[PDB]
Amino acid sequence: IPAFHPGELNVYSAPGDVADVSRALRLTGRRVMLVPTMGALHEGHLALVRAAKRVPGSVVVVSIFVNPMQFGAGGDLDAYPRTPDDDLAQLRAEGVEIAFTPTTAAMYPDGLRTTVQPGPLAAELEGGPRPTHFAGVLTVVLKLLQIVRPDRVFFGEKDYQQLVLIRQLVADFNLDVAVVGVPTVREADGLAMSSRNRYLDPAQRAAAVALSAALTAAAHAATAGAQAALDAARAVLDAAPGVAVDYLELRDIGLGPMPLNGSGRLLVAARLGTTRLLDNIAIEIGTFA
Amino acid sequence: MAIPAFHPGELNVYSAPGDVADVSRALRLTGRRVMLVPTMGALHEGHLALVRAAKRVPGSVVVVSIFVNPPDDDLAQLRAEGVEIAFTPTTAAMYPDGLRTTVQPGPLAAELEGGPRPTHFAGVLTVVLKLLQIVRPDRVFFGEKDYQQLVLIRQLVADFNLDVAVVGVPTVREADGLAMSSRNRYLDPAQRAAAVALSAALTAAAHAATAGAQAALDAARAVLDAAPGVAVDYLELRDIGLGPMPLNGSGRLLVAARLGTTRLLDNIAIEIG
Ligand SMILES: COc1ccc2c(c1)cc(C(=O)NS(=O)(=O)c1ccc3ccccc3c1)n2CC(=O)O
Numbered sequence: 001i002p003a004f005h006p007g008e009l010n011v012y013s014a015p016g017d018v019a020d021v022s023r024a025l026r027l028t029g030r031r032v033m034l035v036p037t038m039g040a041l042h043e044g045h046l047a048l049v050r051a052a053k054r055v056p057g058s059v060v061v062v063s064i065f066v067n068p069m070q071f072g073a074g075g076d077l078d079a080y081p082r083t084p085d086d087d088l089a090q091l092r093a094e095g096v097e098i099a100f101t102p103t104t105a106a107m108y109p110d111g112l113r114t115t116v117q118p119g120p121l122a123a124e125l126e127g128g129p130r131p132t133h134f135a136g137v138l139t140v141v142l143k144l145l146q147i148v149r150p151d152r153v154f155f156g157e158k159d160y161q162q163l164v165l166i167r168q169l170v171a172d173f174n175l176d177v178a179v180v181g182v183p184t185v186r187e188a189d190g191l192a193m194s195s196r197n198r199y200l201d202p203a204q205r206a207a208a209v210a211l212s213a214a215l216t217a218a219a220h221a222a223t224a225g226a227q228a229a230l231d232a233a234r235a236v237l238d239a240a241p242g243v244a245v246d247y248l249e250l251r252d253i254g255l256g257p258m259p260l261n262g263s264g265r266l267l268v269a270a271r272l273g274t275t276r277l278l279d280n281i282a283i284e285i286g287t288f289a
Numbered sequence: 290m291a292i293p294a295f296h297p298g299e300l301n302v303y304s305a306p307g308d309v310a311d312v313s314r315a316l317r318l319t320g321r322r323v324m325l326v327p328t329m330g331a332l333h334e335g336h337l338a339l340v341r342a343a344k345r346v347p348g349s350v351v352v353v354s355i356f357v358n359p360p361d362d363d364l365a366q367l368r369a370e371g372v373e374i375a376f377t378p379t380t381a382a383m384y385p386d387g388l389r390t391t392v393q394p395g396p397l398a399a400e401l402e403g404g405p406r407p408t409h410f411a412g413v414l415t416v417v418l419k420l421l422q423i424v425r426p427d428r429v430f431f432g433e434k435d436y437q438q439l440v441l442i443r444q445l446v447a448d449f450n451l452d453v454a455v456v457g458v459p460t461v462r463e464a465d466g467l468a469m470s471s472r473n474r475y476l477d478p479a480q481r482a483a484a485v486a487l488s489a490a491l492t493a494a495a496h497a498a499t500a501g502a503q504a505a506l507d508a509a510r511a512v513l514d515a516a517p518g519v520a521v522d523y524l525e526l527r528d529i530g531l532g533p534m535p536l537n538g539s540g541r542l543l544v545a546a547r548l549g550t551t552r553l554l555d556n557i558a559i560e561i562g
Pocket residue numbers: 036037038039043044045047048070137141155156157158159182183184185192193194195196
């Protein structure tokens with residue numbers, strides 16, 4: 001097995017290197033925590049890392065891999081922010097002991113061949129116009145889970161549909177891993193952290209606060225019912241300059257095929273110029289609020 | 290969080306996935322190597338050879354799963370083989386949320402057997418994946434008879450970075466060479482006699498192969514052509530991964546045919562020239 005220096009940041013590229021280090025550590029009693037990222041790390045990722053570090057005796061593995069198989073288009077792949085120098089420095093600052101940074105060739109030596117086919121949830125919301133997008137995400141996440149074999153894996157709640165689908169993958173394939181959702185870290189005005197916030201110009205940045213403002217307005221309006229909660233969110237989005245709403249949807253917490261009851265999740269997707277932003281919040285309807 | 294009861298050297302039967310998962314984890318912690326033999330029950334000699342191959346690994350514990358993917362005699366046989374674990378889940382236990390996330394095979398699944406049944410292999414790979422995740426065996430054993438199935442499994446294991454060794458076990462055959470299959474019982478005596486042409490064609494090919502690929506194929510085809518009531522669906526020579534056969538070297542020759550209502554398959558290692 002490769003060298004592993006405790007208390008230091010150890011960087012592995014070969015899947016076999018991280019797998020052997022991981023297994024060795026699990027056998028010596030350390031619980032392995034996985035934080036899978038596409039790099040370009042911000043405070044929301046550091047929140048994921050901090051949550052993983054809280055687990056007694058853990059060793060934290062952060063993966064950084066921009067997965068070509070979840071991009072469609074159209075230069076989306078080429079466009080994705082890459083800032084690997086900032087990434088490793090932050091990990092060192094947080095005392096993470098393993099970074100896993102595989103090559104595309106090591107992840108996909110045979111190209112795309114066997115893949116994960118998500119359930120019907122993957123065709124709706126974000127997946128409506130991107131029909132293979134979530135097959136790309138679940139295939140890579142399955143691979144990462146098999147390579148690292150973590151006890152727990154950590155995701156932000158901001159991409160909530162993705163989180164739900166990952167929980168489905170875990171249940172549906174009997175994966176022996178705990179999925180931990182971490183609440184979305186926000187800028188001080190409530191804007192959800194995101195890699196893509198860097199694409200907002202000053203005016204778009206100012207308008208973008210409408211997404212989180214609409215969602216919290218809805219969560220408080222919801223004592224008056226679902227209609228009022230949705231109408232409040234819609235009004236705030238409507239008042240915002242140059243915000244173009246894609247969808248604004250209220251669903252059950254698992255995102256359907258069940259009607260909303262007392263507790264739910266309100267999801268919004270909107271374009272500012274060319275930048276697509278997503279956010280969501282827990283909603284309690286009526287009495288539960 | 291007490292481990293379910295396990296009595297070493299007895300046949301222990303579990304229906305709950307969580308239970309066999311806890312036991313297999315407890316066993317692996319104490320040194321034993323976990324071996325998995327997936328079956329659909331109605332055990333025959335082919336299954337017993339998979340069991341015998343698994344039992345010979347030193348330190349092995351053998352898990353035999355019995356699951357019909359949508360009797361006490363099976364268990365008796367497993368007992369007589371010294372198998373310690375039978376995993377016998379219900380459909381509901383395996384699919385508590387119904388059909389949802391599934392495995393999509395690569396394009397090999399659309400070829401050969403995937404012609405009459407284009408979603409067959411998606412089903413097989415999904416349930417094999419789940420069985421591997423529940424039991425987490427060091428090694429998993431399949432017969433070579435369903436060769437395309439086997440290759441698709443090794444693609445699954447490679448593609449998803451699974452940490453199991455896939456062991457293909459030579460096909461058990463009747464005395465005249467007919468490959469073991471649960472379907473052989475349905476053949477009336479005329480069909481049963483004609484069915485020997487599949488294996489006869491493939492062994493003839495494998496010996497003709499010193500004279501090259503075309504000789505091997507023409508020898509198999511002549512043998513199939515000497516049999517009445519044997520409607521050949523395909524007869525193909527491929528490399529060992531089921532891609533195109535290289536100009537020489539190692540390959541596999543596969544056949545499938547219908548006799549009355551029964552579809553039969555067989556295959557064989559071929560060495561060119
Ligand atoms: C706890 O607070 C937060 C808040 C926002 C977060 C996160 C954490 C994490 C992300 C995020 O997008 N991370 S990621 O680009 O590196 C990422 C992380 C895991 C992924 C798994 C499958 C597919 C895509 C993935 C993308 N994001 C959102 C974003 O960067 O747009």
